[PDB]
Amino acid sequence: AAQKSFRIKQKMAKAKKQNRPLPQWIRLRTNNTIRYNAKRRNWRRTKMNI
Amino acid sequence: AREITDIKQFLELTRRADVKTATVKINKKLNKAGKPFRQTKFKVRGSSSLYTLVINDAGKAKKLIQSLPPTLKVNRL
Amino acid sequence: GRVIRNQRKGAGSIFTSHTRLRQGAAKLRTLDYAERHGYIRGIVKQIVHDSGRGAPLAKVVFRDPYKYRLREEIFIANEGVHTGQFIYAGKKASLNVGNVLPLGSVPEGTIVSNVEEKPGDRGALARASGNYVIIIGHNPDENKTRVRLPSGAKKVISSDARGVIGVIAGGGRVDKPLLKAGRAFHKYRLKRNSWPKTRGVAMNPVDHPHGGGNHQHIGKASTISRGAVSGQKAGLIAARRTGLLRG
Amino acid sequence: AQRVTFRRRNPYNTRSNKIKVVKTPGGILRAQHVKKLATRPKCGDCGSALQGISTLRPRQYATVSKTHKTVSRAYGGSRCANCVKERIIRAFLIEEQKIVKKVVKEQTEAAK
Amino acid sequence: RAHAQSKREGRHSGYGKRKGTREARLPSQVVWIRRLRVLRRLLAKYRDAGKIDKHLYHVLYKE
Amino acid sequence: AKRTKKVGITGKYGVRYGSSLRRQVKKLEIQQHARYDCSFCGKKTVKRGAAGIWTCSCCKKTVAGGAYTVSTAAAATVRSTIRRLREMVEA
RNA sequence: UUCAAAUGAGAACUUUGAAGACUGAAGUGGGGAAAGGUUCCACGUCAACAGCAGUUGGACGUGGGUUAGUCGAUCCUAAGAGAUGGGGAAGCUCCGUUUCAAAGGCCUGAUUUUAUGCAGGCCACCAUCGAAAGGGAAUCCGGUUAAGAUUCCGGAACCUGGAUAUGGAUUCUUCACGGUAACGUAACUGAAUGUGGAGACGUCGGCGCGAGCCCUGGGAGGAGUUAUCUUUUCUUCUUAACAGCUUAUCACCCCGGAAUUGGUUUAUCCGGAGAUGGGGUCUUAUGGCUGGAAGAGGCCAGCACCUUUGCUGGCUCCGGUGCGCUUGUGACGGCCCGUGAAAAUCCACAGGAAGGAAUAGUUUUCAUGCCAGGUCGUACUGAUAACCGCAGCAGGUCUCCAAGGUGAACAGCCUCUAGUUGAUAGAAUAAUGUAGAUAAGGGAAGUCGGCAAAAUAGAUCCGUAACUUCGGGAUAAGGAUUGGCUCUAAGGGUCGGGACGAUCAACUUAGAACUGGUACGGACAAGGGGAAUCUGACUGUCUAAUUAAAACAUAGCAUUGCGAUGGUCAGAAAGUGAUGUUGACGCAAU
RNA sequence: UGGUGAACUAUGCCUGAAUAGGGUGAAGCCAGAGGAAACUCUGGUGGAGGCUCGUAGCGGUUCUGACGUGCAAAUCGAUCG
Ligand SMILES: [Mg+2]
Ligand SMILES: [Mg+2]
Ligand SMILES: [Mg+2]
Ligand SMILES: [Mg+2]
Ligand SMILES: [Mg+2]
Ligand SMILES: [Mg+2]
Ligand SMILES: [Mg+2]
Ligand SMILES: [Mg+2]
Ligand SMILES: [Mg+2]
Ligand SMILES: [Mg+2]
Ligand SMILES: [Mg+2]
Ligand SMILES: [Mg+2]
Ligand SMILES: [Mg+2]
Ligand SMILES: [Mg+2]
Ligand SMILES: [Mg+2]
Ligand SMILES: [Mg+2]
Ligand SMILES: [Mg+2]
Ligand SMILES: [Mg+2]
Ligand SMILES: [Mg+2]
Ligand SMILES: [Mg+2]
Ligand SMILES: [Mg+2]
Ligand SMILES: [Mg+2]
Ligand SMILES: [Mg+2]
Ligand SMILES: [Mg+2]
Ligand SMILES: [Mg+2]
Ligand SMILES: [Mg+2]
Ligand SMILES: [Mg+2]
Ligand SMILES: [Mg+2]
Ligand SMILES: [Mg+2]
Ligand SMILES: [Mg+2]
Ligand SMILES: [Mg+2]
């Protein structure tokens, strides 16, 4: 809103830091079965609902 | 900012123990009939206010300049 | 099969009175020692309009007998009362318009207003514009006074009940036709949410006892008894008679 | 012609958000937010504006000296100098009338 | 500017060029206010100069 | 010149609401907008603020009166009755 | 939409230039509120996504970016919400918001190792939450980034809280003096308590004034046109918060005593309750001058040039006009059975409790000086792609600023500043379509029905019937005129003076001559009318998404109940509620 | 049976905001005329109205137009209030 509560800003900061692809070295781990970030969130597709 | 018209007041104001800097500014005010003259402005920086004394005569300008205290840091133009 | 409008009014959600602009409750002074034994003089500072009230209000200042200060009282202004007038309230107060006197301290035929039903209730009778109570008799044996009320009813009141000499100001107000819906609108937006009114016969049966039918008609007697229950009392409740009086 | 914008985040024309257009030393037009105009102090008796009292917003009265807020007279910055004159005359005349009233009462109590 | 000069010279003001009513183009109240202000200014000027006395001034003011 | 034959101030209402209602309103609006003698200062300067409130433009006296007239006939009768009763009690 | 160049493996779509257009200032511009949440910006980059394509992107990958004592929140209260005391409920919990309660904190004595000891009253206000548009302490200008700025830098201010010295002021008439007065000032003691003011308020109408804009003259620069004409067309010529002096309609004061009544507004109010007049006092909206401040910003001209990148010089001035537009404001006027918030907060006055006098004896709302001002928000979009609608959806979504012409006009049409040139394209012009049009003669014969379309249309001047609630009907009906050009007349302000003259300035109206393929509200824009019947009085309202109506409402009329131990209505109950901040000219039910 | 909704919409309340230019011309006021008296009349001024033409806004009459596997689970255009 450009006038946001600190609680909203803190949630937005967490979402911003979470918004990243899978680290590549994860795939090389022994017995790894994670292929991509399945919880990837984008601002044009899914709204985070506060 | 505040204008000072009394040279005696300006003299006491230049030694107020909180004023440290002053600026002497030269303005050309030229016209064909009224006056093509040279005006000087003595600006003293006080703690809360800037005091300006306007002198339209060069004789008084130089007298005040040489009457300024030595501890006062003076900028020209 | 649905809760009807007159039933819904009692929950008082959208049907409360609109009191934002009102000057305060209009009432007499608290009956104290000074009014009980002598009189106390007040000064009319203002005659002000009150939102939602036809009658104007007099704002009267009295001195506090026990602490150094002034006390404001909101009286209902009687006809003739003016700013700067002195008001006298008490047992020994004079018989002048605007003065507050016990009903036992006035002769028969006296015209009073804002009359207390019981001594100390600070005014309950003859409060609307142009209304008054007539003192018609005294019974000093039982300390009682007979009065005629605005409705024509005869009443017996304690002679210690107080009243204000005169008639409530603002009379003749209802003699002017409103002429249009908007004036009724502005009249009731300062009072409460009772306007406009939908006729029961214009509704469906679910909404009103008068609802429904292939013509608009009540279909059963509109005189409803006293013992009817909520949702049934729509029409002429406990009507002793109906129709135009004198043919 | 150069058009302007509100300088605060209030986008509505409320009476606390009034502006006027000024020209800056930069040569451009700019909005300037203007405070609500002050109301003159009024007499406590008649309600007319008090002569010789400065017109400020209520908090600004704590900044100026006493000279701006009063007049050199009884009820200086609260009454209008005709109401003060009326107060003086009414007080003197009613006090004299009280003396007359009690002298008359003392005279008429000697009839018996 | 050329059209404005022609309008000042009186052109383009015939019946075929007017689309608003006469009131809309120039209010009759504005015309009356100008006329009455001229008359009152003249009457006051004459009274203050002494060409007329206050009784003649009052009659002329009313009429 | 004569601008209306009979509607007077009710010409603002045009042709609606009916002639009888407009005439009834006419009488009360003429009363309500009339200027009245001030009993205190003696000048034709009393006008209605709101229904029942009558203020003099000079001397600033405000008096409680009728909704559309300064004094109602019932109020005048009440004043006469109160004066008669007070004088009878005093005599 | 087009041409060319650049880039690229690849260009209808990317970038640059050129051209052609559009939005045309209730914008396709510049900002914001809700909402979103990084979409902002840079670099790399095109597998997926983009109604085709793609080297581009609100995509993908990696990072950078949001700086406040003064802008908000934070504080106040609004309609309301809601603990406590207490009552109800098996109970989850419900009522109620000051109540049937033993419901608290101010100053002053203070030995300042240290916090208190007894004093004597001070209202009785009952928690708290409730507004990023209501109230409210205080900041502006210039510059600066890839992206931040009223927050950063430079300069210049202001408020609050605190501390505190000097100067000034005052005092041996202790707590100032002047003015007839309205009142004036650099100050010029003042507790409890009380009173008053500000905060603090509708709407509309014309009038006055201000500001910004619009228009315009002269001059000092720059650019365009220049076959011809054009002392020409375009453009720069600016001045913040704050401060000092000054400046006002209204209001008030002194003198004076008015009929031959006078003064006076566009609007008819005012005067023996003291007018006109003469002279004064005051609010400082607002404007002027000065400081701030030319040192800034703007526009140019000469040299040097990626050597941190510059340097040097000049000018930046003086006028006019107004039913102009937008906006602020003042004094008024109209309207109401409508009279159009509250609190925090600040100040003044009344009162007189205490305290205070001679090389520092008090106090200082006077000047200057010292210190500090926390927390959270701050990027961007705000929509034919950043919100909601399953989406990059022709829908929906609050608000500020608003140039020139035409014209009554924020209408339509064209243009300037700014912005955009986006929506798959190429080729060809069958039928049938959708949208836009035209039509000989007839003129509603069509059809359920003139549906649809056409006709009318602006303005000026003529001329207007029945009927009517006398207000209307009415633009009734029905006619004439309208371009261009050249003129003519009327309608003003100042100043001279002690009967006109001289100067300055608008745009309305009327008339005449001439003129043309008889055209002329030349595009745009813009009533069809009349005679009757049914029906609802009218204005208004409803079936969001098949019904706008004769349906609902309405004023008016009538009836019914009720005097509070009450009528009507609510609740499981209640020491519980709505009407009710009410009282028959009222509330409730029809 | 126990819960969740008044971000849509219905209604009240509180606090804000928004609404060109024209037509008509109520009261009040000023001047004048006719009349023996009653009294009547004219010209101005003024700017009223849940008046009127008509923008923005609000709405949704008709084409029973477009669309009707839509731009859209209610929209588009014109005509309208
Ligand atoms: Mg979305
Ligand atoms: Mg009804
Ligand atoms: Mg029905
Ligand atoms: Mg029944
Ligand atoms: Mg505010
Ligand atoms: Mg006009
Ligand atoms: Mg007129
Ligand atoms: Mg293309
Ligand atoms: Mg593609
Ligand atoms: Mg971008
Ligand atoms: Mg990215
Ligand atoms: Mg603030
Ligand atoms: Mg709060
Ligand atoms: Mg920015
Ligand atoms: Mg700074
Ligand atoms: Mg920011
Ligand atoms: Mg921003
Ligand atoms: Mg932004
Ligand atoms: Mg297209
Ligand atoms: Mg044909
Ligand atoms: Mg033909
Ligand atoms: Mg046929
Ligand atoms: Mg047929
Ligand atoms: Mg048709
Ligand atoms: Mg007809
Ligand atoms: Mg429907
Ligand atoms: Mg809602
Ligand atoms: Mg209307
Ligand atoms: Mg329909
Ligand atoms: Mg269809
Ligand atoms: Mg449609």
Q: How many residues does chain C have?
A: 247
Asked if F touches C (at least 3 Cβ pairs < 8 angstroms), the answer reads yes
| 3-state DSSP of chain A | CCCCCHHHHHHHHHHHHHCCCCCHHHHHCCCCCCCCCCCCCCCCCCCCCC
CA of F4 to C1' of G531 (A): 31
User: Which residues of chain F make contact with C54, given a CB cutoff of 8 A?
Assistant: 51-52, 67
Chain F residues in contact with chain C using a Cβ-Cβ cutoff of 8 Å: 13, 17, 21-22, 24-25, 28, 40, 49-53, 60-69, 71-72, 74-75, 78-79, 81-82, 85-86, 88-89
Confirm if C76 and C131 have CB atoms less than 8 A apart. Answer: no
Confirm if C169 and C81 have CB atoms less than 8 A apart. Answer: yes
The verdict on a CB contact (< 8 Å) between F52 and C83 is: no
CA of B63 to C1' of G317 (A): 33
- Alpha carbon of C82 to ligand 31 centroid (Å): 62
- Rounded Cα distance between C115 and C159, Å, is 11
Q: Residue D66 corresponds to which tokens in the numbers above?
A: 């006493």
Q: Give resolution, Å, one decimal.
A: 2.2
Beta bridge partners of B44: B22, B51
Q: Residue F41 corresponds to which tokens in the numbers above?
A: 């200062």
Find the nucleotide nearest C240 (Cα to C1′).
G560
- Rounded Cα distance between C223 and C16, Å, is 28
Q: Given C84, C110, C167, which is nearest F75 (Cβ)?
A: C167
Closest C-chain CA to F17 = C179
Residue entry with tokens 């003197």: D92
| 3-state DSSP of chain E | CHHHHHHHHCCCCCHHHCCCCHHHHCCHHHHHHHHHHHHHHHHHHHHHHCCCCHHHHHHHHHC
Confirm if C99 and F90 have CB atoms less than 8 A apart. Answer: no
- Rounded Cα distance between D94 and D92, Å, is 6
Burial C116-129 (b: 16+ CB within 10 A, else e): beebeebbebbbbb
- Rounded Cα distance between B29 and B7, Å, is 22
Confirm if C227 and C221 have CB atoms less than 8 A apart. Answer: no
* Inter-chain contacts counted by CB atoms under 8 A, chains C and F: 129
